[PDB]
């Protein structure tokens, strides 16, 4: 509904690069997107750490359902809202190991991982969206992407050097 990005045949990606000396490291994070697709299997938005670091965030599709998996340094834990081609908004937030997710006005789903665990998504490097290089490029519509006070797609519309577009993509207007 908002700033709409369309992934055409095969799809593509907008790639946003953090400056080497300004890469952040946050215990808690906020994620929010509005998609419109009917894919039964795909990966929507992946965000991995720098080289040599296994902390990473993935928000994907499995059997048409929207699941999110992630690791902060110890292991993987996944939560899913157990897509119809319309502008459905999904908000994903975390605080260290604590993880919560919700789609539109549906009841919130939250996880409380057990045991001592790391609590920082150490040294993020870049943001991947659409799964162009994950083997599951996304083909649909994405509006209102958001990340802990950084809506990259809006910066993508601003034509910034840190950001780079690649693959099959179309913009409204």
């Amino acid at each position: 509904a908002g700033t709409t990005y369309i992934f055409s045949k095969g799809g593509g990606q907008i790639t946003y690069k953090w400056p080497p000396n300004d890469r952040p490291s946050t215990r808690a994070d906020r994620l929010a997107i509005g998609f419109s697709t009917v894919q039964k299997e795909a990966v929507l938005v992946r965000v991995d750490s720098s080289s040599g670091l296994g902390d990473y965030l993935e928000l994907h599709i499995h059997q048409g359902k929207i699941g999110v998996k992630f690791n902060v340094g110890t292991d993987d834990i996944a939560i899913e809202e157990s897509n119809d081609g319309k502008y459905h908004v999904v908000r994903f937030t975390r605080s260290g190991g604590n993880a919560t997710l919700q789609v539109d006005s549906w009841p919130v789903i939250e996880r409380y991982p057990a045991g001592r665990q790391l609590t920082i998504f150490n040294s993020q490097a870049t943001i991947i969206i659409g799964g162009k290089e994950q083997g599951q490029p996304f083909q649909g519509q994405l509006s209102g992407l958001y990340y802990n006070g950084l809506k990259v797609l809006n910066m993508a519309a601003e034509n910034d050097a840190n950001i780079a577009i690649v693959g099959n993509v179309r913009l409204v207007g």
């Binding site: 001592r116 920082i120 150490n122």
Partner: peptide, 16 residues
């Protein structure tokens, strides 16, 4: 301090 500094440092617990 949740745990021994060595433990925190080994796993990299800090905001750079």
């Amino acid at each position: 301090v949740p745990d021994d500094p060595e433990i925190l440092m080994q796993q990299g617990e800090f905001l750079n």
